[PDB]
Symmetry: C2
Subunit: 455 residues, 2 copies
């Protein structure tokens, strides 16, 4: 069921064939041997060069990879170009930090001398989503490639060209076959891969449904995992928030990638005094959305990645309204072949409303009204999610104080989400566990090998 179906026109561009049991078997043995090869010999310097090379090609053919993502899951070409740029950076980052992150860590003891090596463990299985085709892969491929963990990837069924093309990208960079292999497999084959003794760990970014499913199979086979699940991020606006600056980030905060971002600012928490003012501003901002062809430079709102996604976001809005939510803006159906959903804003949300605790992976602004910081922090923590979130206050000492009181994995001050090579990314609760990127992400599947020498 792997097809590239352009979200703008809804026309199938390419259909890919599944991988067979034998094919999969061959892929794992190749990967396993490569792991052993990198364990016996020191090919580190080579992988570094190959990783830099990957960055160069991406830079060189940036527009080519960008369009592939647009035609695959229908996001703005300009955004796609941006994703690519972040990828070039994640790649150069680990290729540069390679030696530092891999050197031995000495330990302090009176009993003698001790330290630990950062070694590779084996073949890693990566399960990724469609919202950020290349970023989702590079986020975990770059670190493990440096470490020496061959990788096998099972991407989303709607972005097969990006998954396939990423493998070629790495090969074209001079990487040995098996460094990373894309797998057009079913979920039954995924459980087989996990159950294979040649696979040592699994890193999955996606939905709770799949996360629970994979994590369970992973745990049944004693395999280590890291889950990067969804978010229902709280964008808190304190009394001293800068509104001229606030106006500059709002569009991006909730309409970037049509709202299909795990760290999207799904929940807007605003004070009683600012409630009306905010409704006007969010509305003013949502009105500037120019939807249309995602390849066109002047389009600012892309269509959702699939007909199902659109159906889901709409059902969610409906449900909200059926339970008391107030329709502040949008909600008008769009007439066009594309999987479009116009920006919509809802408020008047209460705890007895199921949407209050649900994540809407679309262009839907949600306004929550509180009477104080205490209440803001309370609403913010009243969630099964804990990925990101934002604190808006001109006083940074103040924003920091509040942020630390939020049960979440990340807090962005006076801005929407941001991802960088050096910054760790992950969350808590139903948003998963484990951190990606930075140095914490580098060691997820590293074997801390202790060498102890007593006196």
């Amino acid at each position: 069921a792997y097809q590239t179906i352009y979200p703008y026109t809804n026309e199938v561009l390419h259909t890919f064939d599944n991988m067979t049991d034998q094919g999969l078997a061959d892929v794992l043995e190749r990967a396993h041997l490569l792991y052993k090869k990198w364990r016996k010999e020191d090919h580190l310097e080579e992988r570094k060069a190959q990783l830099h090379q990957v960055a160069n090609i991406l830079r060189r053919d940036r527009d080519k990879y960008a369009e592939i993502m647009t035609k695959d899951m229908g996001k703005l070409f300009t955004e796609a170009q941006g994703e690519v740029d972040l990828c070039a950076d994640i790649a150069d980052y680990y290729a540069d930090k390679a030696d530092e992150f891999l050197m031995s860590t000495p330990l302090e003891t009176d009993s003698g001398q001790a330290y630990y090596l950062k070694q590779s463990t084996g073949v890693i299985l990566a399960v990724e989503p469609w919202n950020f085709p290349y970023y989702q892969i590079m986020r975990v491929f770059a670190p493990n490639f440096i470490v020496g963990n061959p990788m096998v990837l099972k991407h989303a069924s709607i972005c097969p060209r990006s998954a396939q093309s990423f493998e070629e990208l790495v090969l074209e960079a001079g990487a040995e076959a098996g460094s990373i292999t894309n797998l057009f497999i079913s979920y039954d084959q995924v459980s087989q891969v996990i159950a294979d003794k040649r696979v040592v760990g699994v890193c999955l970014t996606g939905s709770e449904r799949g996360g629970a499913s994979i994590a369970e199979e992973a745990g049944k086979n004693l395999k280590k995992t890291t889950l990067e699940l969804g978010g229902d991020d709280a964008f808190i606006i304190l009394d001293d928030a800068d509104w001229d600056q606030l106006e500059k980030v709002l569009y991006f905060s909730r309409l970037y990638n049509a709202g299909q971002v795990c760290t999207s600012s799904k929940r807007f928490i605003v004070l009683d005094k600012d409630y009306d003012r905010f409704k006007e501003l969010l509305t003013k901002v949502f009105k500037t959305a120019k939807w249309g062809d995602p390849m066109d430079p002047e389009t600012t709102l892309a269509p959702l990645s699939s007909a199902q996604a659109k159906a889901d976001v709409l059902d969610q809005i409906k449900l909200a309204l059926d339970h008391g939510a107030e329709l502040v803006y949008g909600g008008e159906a769009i007439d066009h072949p594309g999987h479009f959903v116009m920006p919509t804003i809802i408020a008047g949300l209460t705890k007895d409303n199921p949407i209050y605790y649900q994540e809407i992976f679309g262009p839907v602004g949600e306004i929550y009204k509180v009477s104080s910081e205490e209440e803001a922090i309370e609403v913010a923590n009243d969630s099964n999610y804990g990925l990101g979130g934002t604190i808006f206050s001109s006083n940074q000492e103040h924003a920091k104080a509040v942020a630390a009181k939020i049960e979440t994995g990340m807090s962005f001050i006076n801005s929407g989400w941001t991802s960088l090579p050096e910054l760790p990314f992950g969350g808590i609760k139903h948003s998963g566990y484990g951190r990606e990127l930075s140095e914490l992400g580098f060691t997820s599947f590293v074997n801390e090998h202790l060498i102890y020498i007593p006196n």
Copy 2:
């Protein structure tokens, strides 16, 4: 059923009542509320003091807690005193490193100000084994207590007195009720606990069967886990090994805690040149064993923890022989009420013999003969386990170079296994994943909360 049956006499000394469903419900709610209290307001100093107090009491009543373990799982009283000493240590270590370890981490980035907080996450379920009643508990309790994660313990059924007394110990130290609670629950209840939204993680130490079951349930519920399973450590004696030292550590290496140590030196790998020389030495060492009353200072070999335990080891010895292994020494049945198994040595194991790959949790020396150093590394790695291991050589750099080629979590140079609060403990493969102790085990269930302020 949770019962204390002295392994020496096989007499029932205690019979505890299983925890009721409502009792379980109340415990988790108390733990949840306590977690919230420590998350909303700082009580680190109080916890530090109380942990130091736990150490003080242990120091004071060492012999009382030692006898408890001996009567619970039958270990030598002197070994138990040693255990308590290691607990006192772990406790003080974490109380002393508290501030340092819980310190925020700055992040280098030229795009803005960034750092991450180390925060508590919730209630942790701990499943610990019987081979080290107190040590096993302290390994995870100390770090998590300082962190601020209340804890619920599910200990082995054969050492309920230990499990229960440890909770009392913590309450005596002054720690608020809920810091750690012992649960005399069934495995169905353990499953319920794992499914509870109040529990945020699971750290288990035990068998593969239990681990798979527990990790499977944890995964189905998105709960992070760390597993400390068995081992079959390779004790490699290089060509330049010093036999004076070798002789001094041999008894401890395999007969400490009667061989019931995950890091016991289960697989001795020697060169042809030293094969017969080693068979004599190991035999000489094993002959010095004096089994008897564990409370008696004279005793140098304790009975196993249970009848089933003995039955199992005896079967493994039998199985090895029925498949070709050679009986180098012992194997004779001890006529006595206790669960005694006389020290035994076997050799001539081949890949076609099941025992070649099985871990024996008893006083059974195993000898593997190799013709080269490379073959030694091969046999060492030809294992489904990868916990610890020892490299014996008079050349430090040589020993360190060989260690690095072993696929294991810990390597001990010129010595048997050791465990200090500053040293990370953990392995790879079927030995599990994750680490305990040192700073690494500290952050296992910690929330790295990124705070990001762009320029």
